[PDB]
Scaffold this active site. Structure first.
Site, PDB file in Angstrom:
ATOM      1  N   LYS A 228       0.858  -1.202   0.000  1.00 52.32           N
ATOM      2  CA  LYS A 228       0.000   0.000   0.000  1.00 52.32           C
ATOM      3  C   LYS A 228       0.891   1.248   0.000  1.00 52.32           C
ATOM      4  O   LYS A 228       0.665   2.191   0.765  1.00 52.32           O
ATOM      5  CB  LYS A 228      -0.880   0.001   1.237  1.00 52.32           C
ATOM      6  CG  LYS A 228      -1.921  -1.136   1.230  1.00 52.32           C
ATOM      7  CD  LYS A 228      -2.819  -1.035   2.498  1.00 52.32           C
ATOM      8  CE  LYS A 228      -4.095  -1.812   2.269  1.00 52.32           C
ATOM      9  NZ  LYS A 228      -4.923  -1.729   3.459  1.00 52.32           N
ATOM     10  N   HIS A 250      -2.339  -0.405  -3.034  1.00 54.07           N
ATOM     11  CA  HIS A 250      -2.368   1.070  -3.147  1.00 54.07           C
ATOM     12  C   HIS A 250      -0.987   1.538  -3.560  1.00 54.07           C
ATOM     13  O   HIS A 250       0.043   0.990  -3.129  1.00 54.07           O
ATOM     14  CB  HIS A 250      -2.744   1.788  -1.836  1.00 54.07           C
ATOM     15  CG  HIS A 250      -4.164   1.542  -1.375  1.00 54.07           C
ATOM     16  ND1 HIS A 250      -5.264   1.666  -2.215  1.00 54.07           N
ATOM     17  CD2 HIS A 250      -4.637   1.136  -0.177  1.00 54.07           C
ATOM     18  CE1 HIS A 250      -6.356   1.378  -1.521  1.00 54.07           C
ATOM     19  NE2 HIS A 250      -6.015   1.068  -0.276  1.00 54.07           N
ATOM     20  N   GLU A 311      -9.810   4.398  -4.513  1.00 51.66           N
ATOM     21  CA  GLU A 311      -9.641   3.378  -3.489  1.00 51.66           C
ATOM     22  C   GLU A 311      -9.521   1.991  -4.129  1.00 51.66           C
ATOM     23  O   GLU A 311      -8.985   1.064  -3.520  1.00 51.66           O
ATOM     24  CB  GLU A 311     -10.888   3.416  -2.605  1.00 51.66           C
ATOM     25  CG  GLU A 311     -11.189   2.382  -1.563  1.00 51.66           C
ATOM     26  CD  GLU A 311     -10.420   2.572  -0.277  1.00 51.66           C
ATOM     27  OE1 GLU A 311     -10.847   3.492   0.471  1.00 51.66           O
ATOM     28  OE2 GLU A 311      -9.522   1.774   0.072  1.00 51.66           O
TER      29      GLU A 311
END
Lengths: 492, 491
Positions: A228, A250, A311
């Site tokens: 992430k 991410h 997201e």
């Protein structure tokens, strides 16, 4: 450079605050119960402070224990963590780990963690200080993480105390290395924490190197690694019989190079990589998944559909080269996983839904023993850049590929196939602070082979500890403690 | 595959066609008079599951029964209530309402409440007609309340009946009973308690009874009647129970890390009663605010009598690292039922003896009652009293080293300044029970008592009935219980 021998928890406490650069605090054989080791002094780069077992495998940290490496140039070495008993009310997911690294330039090496206790935390974290300072340039290596029955990842590498998805300031690059570690951990329910998490969101910079690790039935949750943050490199890792995927979850600009995603049975769905975001390099990876994961889309490589930079960031503008998709039971590449859910998500956040596009697919080898029952791709290829790729063994949509033939037996290297050619890549950027020539490594292709236990284990440890890797189940005491953890969670 | 069925007839139409890996899912509803006989078998990797689609919505009622005769079968999330078995077709020592005839079987998440008036256990492991013993079965996350019938709640069998003179050992069973809840009303006489394992000293059990919660398990004097060798009772919580967990027959049993606790002083509570030798009683916490007058008012009772007999002497055993915390009675009674055991000894022409060669080390004895509290009754000279510890004035405490607490509310003697665990060595493990017994002893009292949310089926929010809650049975159950009791008194 003084060796200082101690034999009890009280003798450790009596020396820890007097340690100097070059000192080695050597622990004699024994059980150090309820040891709360807080190291605030610092070594120097040429003379670290080392805290180590005199004999690896004979020093156990047990009971209500913890380690805080708060100084710099510290090494925690050859400690075995088992028979734990922390207060479950004093620890939580997203907090510090059993070993928490608060200072920069620190190392945890040769340490074993097996079914430690019932307090939810990571086994190791890099943790921010109370004033917000981010530890950098740390190393976790030759460690063993098995039979974890608690929530949260095995390892968390943090550059914020919690995710801050709307922040305009980037999370600071960390420059850590996790290497030659072993992971085997049982399934937990829900979003329970996987093997490694690096950062929290798209606005975090990682620049961490995760190399030469061996994951064997790392089955804690859907994500083996939940990467992430931006610009992390996953190099030369072996993922064997793992019920999950290594994810670029991410953060753009991540690299997966020369890994092995392999299996030795078809008992459960195994992975695999799931990719969100753009500007990634997925190169020289070998996939042989005898069963893939139905809930994700039954594939070796999954490319996320969705809104750009969200997201659930769209996978696009990336490079997939020189991989070997060898007899996967499933699609080799799925360009439309979780399609309906992603369409619903894009509507929820009022953003444009897109399918993956501008992904260059070149120099890959696709092989199958399953005939036309094997379909290499699911989804929209014309939105992408399908260049020269190669295949051996009849499969659906075969006309896309140039026929090639093996010359060796048991080779993981497509360059051993007659007719095969590597991708022509150019202008590949290296990642700041990671001492790897990425273009040169892409151009060498698949020269490696899968890691085994003896390639990563601590030199003093003969057998894999614990029971999940060996038996596929937990030992009786650990099963009972695990049922306590799960009941407390269900009722929280 | 999942096979949905919605009636008793539809269950019978599928049950004999099940294959390894199939789940027979019962739709919500009442399955009255269902006689579920599962003859097919699963495999190690792919059991056959018979389960409620929705736990708490399927009821087996009426003149019902379950026979698990195949292997690798799981019966899951069934609620047994509103029963009506023919009382002339069932007897104590026969099969249970659920009878497990095959090995490698599991009953999980099933609830039993005041089922009917037919005397039987609620679950047994039962021998086949030809005599084959089931092994390696598991009963877990089950709930057993308001039992108004004779016989234990659970019987684990390796013989049809006690064969007390045999030299062939009863076969090791290797079962596990875990995360179960028991709360059941008093019955008269030797009426059957919570669990029976085996029948006599020549039976091998090797069963693991762990992580169970007994709350007002009051059926009779015995919460557990352990009647076979080498069973392990680990990490169970016994709360306000009018009875004792017993090592009744069979040497070489283990009670490790249990809690024998109480939250009022209304009734006599227990407690453990021990017959036989080569036992380990370790890491148990006792806080009994009233003890059982008829047994000798103690937390731990060690049986006097002849060795190896029907009332086997307790001797050559290890009692270590336990915490006897403010018990109202003796902590250890070494002479319970003294005159009755002397008379028994004379009746069987065997030498009467008092407990001897018991090593008592590393225990913590605490009290708020002053010199009125007496920790031991009986002969200590015959035994190996090593280093033990105490906190709070009590009688005869010169035998102990004084220690002091460092926190409030700790169940762990290692939190007391001056306390030391026992020095133990060469403790061997029991075959087929995957617990490192010596390491567990050496870690001490690290746990805490179980609560209902620690054991319950995930689908069941509240304890069924009100016996644990109010000592009461519902009106229909009280009327049915009186029928059972009148039939017994007139049999």
């Amino acid at each position: 450079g003084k060796h200082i021998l101690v034999a009890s928890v009280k003798e450790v406490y009596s020396k820890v605050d007097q340690l100097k650069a070059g000192d080695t605090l050597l622990l004699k054989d024994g059980i150090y119960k309820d040891i709360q080791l807080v190291v605030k002094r610092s070594g120097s780069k040429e003379k670290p402070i080392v805290i180590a077992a005199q004999n690896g495998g004979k020093v156990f940290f047990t009971g209500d224990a913890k380690v805080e490496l708060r100084g710099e140039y510290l090494v925690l070495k050859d400690i075995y963590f088992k028979d734990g008993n922390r207060n479950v009310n004093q620890w939580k997911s997203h907090g510090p780990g059993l070993v928490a690294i608060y200072g920069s330039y620190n190392r945890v090496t040769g340490c074993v963690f097996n079914a430690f206790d019932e307090a939810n935390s990571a086994y190791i974290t890099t943790s921010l200080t109370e004033e917000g300072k981010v530890p950098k340039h740390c190393r976790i290596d030759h460690c063993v993480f098995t039979d974890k029955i608690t929530f949260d990842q095995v390892i968390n590498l943090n550059n914020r105390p919690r995710a801050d998805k709307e922040s305009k300031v980037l999370g600071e690059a960390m420059y850590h290395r996790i290497d030659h570690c072993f992971f085997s951990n049982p399934p937990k329910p829900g979003n329970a924490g996987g093997g490694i998490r690096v950062g929290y969101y798209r606005n975090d910079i990682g620049r961490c190197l995760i190399d030469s690790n061996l994951f064997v039935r790392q089955d804690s949750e859907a994500e083996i690694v939940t990467s992430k943050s931006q610009e992390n490199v996953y190099y030369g890792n072996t993922i064997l019989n793992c019920q999950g995927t290594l994810n670029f979850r991410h953060g753009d600009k991540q690299v997966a190079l020369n890994n092995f995603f392999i299996s030795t049975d078809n008992k459960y769905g195994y992975g695999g990589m799931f990719v969100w975001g753009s500007q990634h390099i997925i190169a020289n990876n070998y996939f042989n998944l005898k069963k893939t994961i139905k809930a994700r889309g039954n594939a070796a490589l999954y490319l996320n559909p969705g809104p750009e930079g969200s997201e659930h960031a769209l996978a696009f503008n990336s490079l997939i080269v020189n991989n070997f998709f060898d007899d996967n039971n499933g699609y080799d590449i799925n360009f439309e996983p979780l399609l309906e859910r992603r369409k619903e998500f894009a509507k929820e956040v009022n953003a444009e839904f897109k399918l993956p596009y501008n992904i260059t697919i070149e120099g890959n080898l696709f092989a199958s023993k399953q005939g036309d029952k094997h379909i290499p791709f699911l989804g929209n290829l014309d939105k992408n850049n399908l260049q020269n790729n190669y295949s051996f063994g009849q499969m659906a949509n075969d006309k896309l590929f140039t026929n090639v033939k093996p010359t060796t037996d048991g080779s993981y290297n497509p360059q051993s196939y007659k007719g095969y050619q590597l991708a022509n890549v150019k202008d590949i950027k290296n990642i700041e602070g990671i001492d790897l020539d990425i273009q040169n490594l892409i151009n060498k292709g698949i020269e490696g082979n899968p890691l085994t236990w003896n390639d990563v284990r601590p030199s003093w440890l003969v057998e894999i500890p614990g029971s999940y890797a060996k038996e596929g189940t937990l030992d009786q005491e650990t099963k009972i403690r695990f049922q306590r953890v799960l009941a407390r969670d269900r009722n929280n």
